[PDB]
Amino acid sequence: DSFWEVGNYKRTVKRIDDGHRLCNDLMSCVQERAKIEKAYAQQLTDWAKRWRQLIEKGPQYGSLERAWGAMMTEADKVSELHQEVKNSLLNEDLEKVKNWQKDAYHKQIMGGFKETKEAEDGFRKAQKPWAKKMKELEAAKKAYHLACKEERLAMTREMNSKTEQSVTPEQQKKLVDKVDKCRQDVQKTQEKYEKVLEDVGKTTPQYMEGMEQVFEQCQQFEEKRLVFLKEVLLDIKRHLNLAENSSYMHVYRELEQAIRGADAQEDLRWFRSTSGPGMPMNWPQFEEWNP
């Protein structure tokens, strides 16, 4: 199953098609993740809107009302941050992959791709003379062996031509003439087989150089891809990670400050003055007769 056997360069060529398919998959992968980020964010938004309305119009009041209110703003801020992840995934990373793919893989009539075609033809071309020589080698080999077999038979007849009932002088001469015909053919076919072998030996460096050049062109093209995708994977790491800058942290700094700011006594004193003993009052006094 060696690369060096006729045909087995295909594996390298399939890699070029696979590269394209891998870009698609990666784009689909980040798109689906963007979707998941958008869902989470919208649900945080809904909750925020829902509970900000229920807290406002509900009986909670004062600084504790606002403290509880502060939860809805963290949800909005966290929603916003996950919408930014979504935006980055789609607008930067996905697009970066989409565009690299466009400049790297050019479709033919009739696909698949020119890049796969080039490599195919390259490998075919580099291997054509070799392949032909290998067929000739195989023909010369069997030819040689068919001579070696026929000689062993012609000889095997000489063994039992000595001790067999009917053996005339005419055939005993023709039998010896036969083995010399075989021997001369074993030689003729051995020379041709040896000659093809020699040709195969002289051709081999060029066969190798040619294939190794096409292969290296494939290796280089794959490298552009592996280097690009590693960079894209870093882009995605950084866009997924909300700890990449301090905005995420500040969301919770602010939340905690709003909560700690809430004061029970302040709220109490407010209720006192607006609904309690702290309210002013017109105390009874003498009222004269009207009008």
Residue 84 beta carbon to its own copies: minimum distance, rounded to whole angstroms:
15
DSSP for 14-34 reads HHHHHHHHHHHHHHHHHHHHH
Residues of this chain, 127-146, that bind its own copies according to CB under 8 A: 134, 137, 141, 144-145
Say if residues 80 and 41 touch (Cβ distance below 8 Å).
yes
Residue among 131, 139, 153, 226 that touches its own copies (CB under 8 A): 226
Largest Cα–Cα distance in the chain? 176
Residue 36 beta carbon to its own copies: minimum distance, rounded to whole angstroms:
5
C-alpha 276/C-alpha 269 separation (Å) is: 9
Beta bridge partners of 107: 113
Contacts of 182 (CB under 8 A, 6+ apart): 147, 150, 151, 153, 154, 155
The separation between the first and the last C-alpha atoms of the chain, rounded to the nearest angstrom, is 121
Helix (H) and strand (E) counts in the chain: 7, 0
C-alpha 127/C-alpha 149 separation (Å) is: 33
Residue among 143, 155, 175, 255 that touches its own copies (CB under 8 A): 255
Q: Closer CB to its own copies, residue 62 or residue 171?
A: 62
Residue among 95, 177, 191, 223 that touches its own copies (CB under 8 A): 223
The answer to whether residue 56 forms part of the interface with its own copies (CB under 8 A) is: no
In one letter, which amino acid is 170? Answer: E
Residue among 125, 128, 181, 272 that touches its own copies (CB under 8 A): 272
Q: Closer CB to its own copies, residue 162 or residue 202?
A: 202
Q: Closer CB to its own copies, residue 15 or residue 171?
A: 15
Contacts of 144 (CB under 8 A, 6+ apart): 186, 189, 190, 192, 193
Tokens for 31, please give them.
Answer: 């798109």
Q: What is the x/- site pattern for its own copies, positions 180-219, by CB under 8 A?
A: -------------xx--x--xx--x---x--xx--x---x
Residue among 21, 49, 125, 173 that touches its own copies (CB under 8 A): 21
Residues of this chain, 25-44, that bind its own copies according to CB under 8 A: 25-26, 29, 32-33, 36, 39-40, 43-44
> What is residue 246's DSSP assignment?
T
The 3-state DSSP class for residue 107 equals strand
Cis peptide before 62 (omega within 30 of 0): no
The answer to whether residue 53 forms part of the interface with its own copies (CB under 8 A) is: no
Residue among 6, 54, 153, 167 that touches its own copies (CB under 8 A): 54
Residues of this chain, 84-123, that bind its own copies according to CB under 8 A: none
Residue among 5, 56, 95, 121 that touches its own copies (CB under 8 A): 5
Instruction: Return the axis-axis angle of helices 10-57 and 62-88, rounded to nearest 10°.
Output: 160
The 3-state DSSP class for residue 95 equals helix
The answer to whether residue 286 forms part of the interface with its own copies (CB under 8 A) is: yes
CB under 8 A: which stretch of 19-27, 89-97, 112-120, 161-169 binds its own copies? 19-27
Residue 154 beta carbon to its own copies: minimum distance, rounded to whole angstroms:
14
Q: Closer CB to its own copies, residue 12 or residue 116?
A: 12
The answer to whether residue 60 forms part of the interface with its own copies (CB under 8 A) is: yes
